[PDB]
Specification:
By secondary structure, the chain is an alpha/beta fold. It has 4 helices and 11 strands, in the order E-E-H-E-H-E-E-H-E-H-E-E-E-E-E. About 20% of the residues lie in helices and about 30% in strands. The chain is globular. Pathway: Cofactor biosynthesis; tetrahydrofolate biosynthesis; 5,6,7,8-tetrahydrofolate from 7,8-dihydrofolate: step 1/1. Key enzyme in folate metabolism. Contributes to the de novo mitochondrial thymidylate biosynthesis pathway. Catalyzes an essential reaction for de novo glycine and purine synthesis, and for DNA precursor synthesis. Binds its own mRNA and that of DHFR2.
Length: about 190
């Protein structure tokens, strides 16, 4: 298995969701960026794995579930099988990464992308190891009911640039946003 990563878009007041929808108007190029980063695998003959909680999975419109060209794993203790269209189910983040080491996935998975929601972000972010955060800063306040966990800048270093990540300010639908990459290793 390659690198472990979170990827998120977040408003200025830290909001990542409002009733399981985007707090902001849909940004098509911001979504393109999400699909590119998560789908692109270095290693030939492998796909990236995406890991998400159950609410995050059910927040995706049906036409976009599973995320195509990526292996989809949902986290849940209540579910007893992967939801319709998903590939894998695990009880917890720890268990999902342990699986990634079994024979049915060890040779299949390149990068792992945690795509939410806020409790799965929080445990990944607080767990020791090499982890990057791909964070889009939406530079406006948007009403939200779910939030990104605090980024501890003592541990996470913001990278001065990163291949395939535009560094300058973007704007769609009248909303300015920018891409950032953070990296810890502890
Ligand atoms: C969990 O699945 C998806 C989530 C999102 C939200 C999202 C959007 N942008 C960024 N940078 N990160 C995110 N996590 C965007 C998506 O496609 C644009 C997803 O695939 C269906
Ligand atoms: C591309 O993936 C998403 C797209 C949208 C906006 C959207 C875009 N197209 C359609 N048909 N329905 C929608 N709700 C909304 C989302 O979250 C509610 C998505 O999940 C990350």
């Amino acid at each position: 298995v390659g690198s472990l990563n979170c990827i998120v878009a977040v408003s200025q007041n830290m909001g990542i969701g409002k009733n399981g929808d985007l707090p902001w108007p849909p940004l098509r190029n911001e979504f393109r960026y999400f699909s590119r980063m998560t789908t692109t695998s270095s290693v030939e003959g492998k796909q990236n794995l995406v890991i998400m909680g159950k609410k995050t999975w059910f927040s995706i419109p049906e036409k976009f579930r599973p995320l195509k060209g990526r292996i989809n794993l949902v986290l849940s203790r209540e579910l007893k099988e992967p939801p319709q269209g998903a590939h894998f189910l695990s009880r917890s983040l720890d268990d999902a990464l342990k699986l990634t080491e079994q024979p049915e996935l060890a040779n299949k998975v390149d990068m792992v992308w945690i795509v939410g929601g806020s409790s799965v972000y929080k445990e990944a972010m607080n767990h020791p190891g090499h982890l990057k955060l791909f964070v889009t800063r939406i530079m406006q306040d948007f009403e939200s009911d779910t939030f990104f966990p605090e980024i501890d800048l003592e541990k996470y270093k913001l990278l001065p640039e990163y291949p395939g990540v535009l560094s300058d300010v973007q704007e769609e639908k009248g909303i300015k946003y920018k891409f950032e990459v953070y990296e810890k290793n502890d």
